[PDB]
């Protein structure tokens, strides 16, 4: 099996790609959300302009033309109400989603902070078992190794 420690570097390194991969997409959501916000305002301005024409059309005692303009505005107004409802729903998700990532970023670095600590312990442990293994190879008769096994020669 591959060395478990090497994975930690790969896992966090691979995870870091996911973090930036995740972060880039989040930008796309807000920009699209902002765009949809412009459409509501843009269409509303058109409806407001239609209202202005209705005011001018209503003036001079011509009411029949105003009725048609008012009916025309209703079609646009329907989108305003419909799109406005969609915008409100997405607000919670865009705010909520940032919450997990905000906690995610702090958690990710904390794990990486402690990552190198164990590497030092394990590498010291690896050396720790190697030093007395070599010293064991030169210890007393309890091991009967080179330091005592070469003097026999």
């Amino acid at each position: 099996q591959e060395a478990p420690e090497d994975l930690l570097e790969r896992l966090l390194g691979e995870m870091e790609l996911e973090l930036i991969e995740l972060r880039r997409a989040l930008a796309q959501t807000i920009a699209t959300f902002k765009s949809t916000e412009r459409q509501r305002d843009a269409q509303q301005l058109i409806a407001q302009r239609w209202y202005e024409k209705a005011q001018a059309a209503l003036d001079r005692g011509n009411e029949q033309l105003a009725r048609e303009a008012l009916g025309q505005r209703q079609s646009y107004q329907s989108h305003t109400e419909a799109l406005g409802k969609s915008l409100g729903e997405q607000r919670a998700l865009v705010e909520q989603v940032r919450g997990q990532l905000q906690k995610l970023e702090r958690k990710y670095l904390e794990l990486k902070s402690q990552k190198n600590l164990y590497l030092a312990r394990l590498k010291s442990a690896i050396a720790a078992q190697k030093i007395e293994e070599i010293a064991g190879n030169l210890d007393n008769a309890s091991a009967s190794s080179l330091f005592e096994r070469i003097e026999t020669k």
């Binding site: 930008a27 807000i30 902002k34």
Partner: peptide, 11 residues
């Protein structure tokens, strides 16, 4: 521009 601008906010 917006999405790149949105990225600036996140960083």
């Amino acid at each position: 521009i917006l999405e790149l601008e949105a990225e600036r906010e996140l960083l």
